[PDB]
């Protein structure tokens, strides 16, 4: 009866334990295409995820996606730190799906940007809707981290986002 065992309801197979309310609207506003963090805010949002079984990892900030005119990270690159904070973490999550307000035409290249593509636990395109993080969808990441990589990595990546996404949202307002 542990929560790490019953992440999944026995009617459908859907996950019931997943983000609700603010965490979803936190991580959507963070993985939205427009956000850009400098190494000021980037190491501040990331270092929120270092308490309570997580304080003993060499947290690897990914290299930034703009270099020359100003160097700054993007929002989705910091959401990848949720799925794989350390260097020696064995999680490689993979997911490709539609989203809400889907563009209809175009696979992943249209400007509406509602098409998630995660390769090796690095969010490559798209923004995290409810349908890619919440409860009820069989293609959110916490369901994908459950089936492919055990249930400890799904509960850790869900308890990482609950710590990370309010720390962004309370400073974004």
């Amino acid at each position: 009866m542990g929560t790490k065992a019953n992440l999944v309801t026995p009617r459908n197979g859907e996950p019931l334990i997943a983000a609700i309310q603010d965490f979803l609207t936190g991580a959507y506003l963070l993985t939205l295409k427009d956000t850009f963090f400098d190494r000021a805010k980037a190491c501040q949002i990331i270092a929120s995820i270092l308490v309570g079984k997580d304080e003993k990892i060499k947290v690897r900030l990914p290299p930034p996606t703009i270099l020359k005119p100003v160097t700054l990270w993007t929002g989705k690159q910091i959401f990848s730190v949720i799925l794989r904070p350390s260097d020696d973490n064995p999680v490689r999550a993979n997911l490709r799906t539609k989203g809400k307000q889907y563009c209809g035409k175009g696979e992943d290249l249209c400007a509406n940007d509602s098409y998630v593509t995660i390769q090796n636990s690095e969010l490559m395109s798209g923004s995290m809707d409810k349908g890619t993080l919440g409860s009820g969808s069989k293609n959110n990441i916490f369901y994908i981290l459950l089936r492919d990589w055990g249930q400890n990595e799904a509960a850790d990546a869900m308890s990482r986002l609950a710590r990370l996404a309010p720390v962004y949202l309370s400073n974004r307002g």
Binding site: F37, D38, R39, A40, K41, K68, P69, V70, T71, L72
Partner: protein, 330 residues
């Protein structure tokens, strides 16, 4: 091409540039790696309008992270003296006992801290080096020359209202270092503690202790200790011909001159009325300077506000020398 990492820019729907974004290897071409003498030269403090119980100095040239220390340190880490234990005797007032004892807590006390020390143990007796006792004995009757009117100052008014004038000071020990108005009860002598009707008493001793503001907010030395970045408003287009007096009533009143000139930007409250105009919202970008803010300290009256700030910096320096001596142990 041009870099406003130095102005936050306020749009109609959001605030655009916000985070400080000035650390080594962020903005190519710019070396910003904490040159100490560069900070030492580009920084000044411009004091505006210091009477009693206010202060509006500037501190131009620090990041908004250390500025949010001095706001926070002022708010809840500069110590003051306030009433903590109300030894109650007969109290027949209709005001309840704890609510009286809580309302004695919020009264500020003019005896300055850093003459006293903290209360080490429980130590409910006090040691006259830690505490500061007050007495309150009010028993109201009818006055004999009262007319037949129902005017509570005239009849029933021996002491109908328990003001803070009725509090007195029981010098605990030598207490000759402090003078006659030296521990001026409650900084404000007009504070209404409770009301009475004849035949009712309030008899209570008090104990004052030195407390951090974050322990309880009655120890807070300052009413508001907020700060705000100095705005600067740039008309990108020259405005004239009755649109200037349109832009006059749009902003705060003193901010503007009438052609249109942005005469004095410091007085601007961010109403953001430009975006209602639909014509001038493309004309002028409004912005606030990042490293030029405006502090506004208004003390309750325990310590004068020019000594609150110089105490607020003094305990941040003490908070980091407390840690630098930890590394010297290890």
């Amino acid at each position: 091409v041009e870099e406003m990492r130095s102005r936050v820019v306020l749009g109609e729907f959001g605030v655009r540039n916000v985070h400080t974004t000035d650390f080594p290897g962020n903005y190519s071409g710019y070396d910003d790696a904490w040159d100490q003498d560069r900070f030492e030269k580009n920084f000044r403090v411009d004091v505006v309008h210091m009477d009693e119980n206010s202060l509006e100095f500037d501190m131009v040239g620090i990041d908004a992270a250390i500025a949010n220390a001095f706001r926070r340190i002022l708010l809840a880490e500069v110590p003051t003296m306030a009433v903590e234990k109300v030894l109650v005797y007969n109290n027949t007032s209709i005001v309840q006992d704890e609510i009286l004892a809580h309302r004695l807590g919020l009264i500020p006390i003019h005896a300055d801290p850093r003459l006293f020390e903290y209360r080490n143990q429980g130590d409910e007796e006090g040691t006259e080096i830690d505490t500061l006792q007050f007495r309150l004995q009010v028993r109201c009757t009818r006055n004999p020359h009262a007319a037949k009117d129902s005017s509570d100052p005239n009849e029933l008014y021996v002491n109908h209202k328990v003001y803070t004038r009725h509090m007195t000071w029981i010098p605990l020990g030598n207490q000759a270092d402090l003078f006659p108005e030296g521990t001026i009860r409650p900084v404000h002598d007009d504070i209404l503690i409770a009301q009475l009707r004849p035949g009712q008493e309030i008899d209570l001793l008090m104990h004052c202790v030195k407390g951090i503001g974050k322990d309880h907010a009655k120890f807070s030395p300052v009413a508001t200790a907020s700060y705000r970045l100095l705005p600067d408003i740039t008309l990108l287009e020259p405005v004239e011909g009755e649109a200037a007096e349109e832009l006059s009533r749009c902003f705060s009143p003193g901010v503007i001159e009438v052609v249109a000139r942005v005469a004095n930007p410091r007085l601007d409250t961010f109403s953001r009325e430009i975006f209602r105009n639909e014509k001038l919202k493309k004309v002028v970008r409004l912005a606030r300077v990042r490293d030029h803010y405006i502090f506004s300290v208004e003390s309750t009256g325990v310590l004068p506000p020019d000594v609150l700030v110089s105490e607020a910096i003094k305990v941040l320096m003490g908070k980091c020398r407390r840690f630098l001596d930890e590394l010297d142990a290890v």
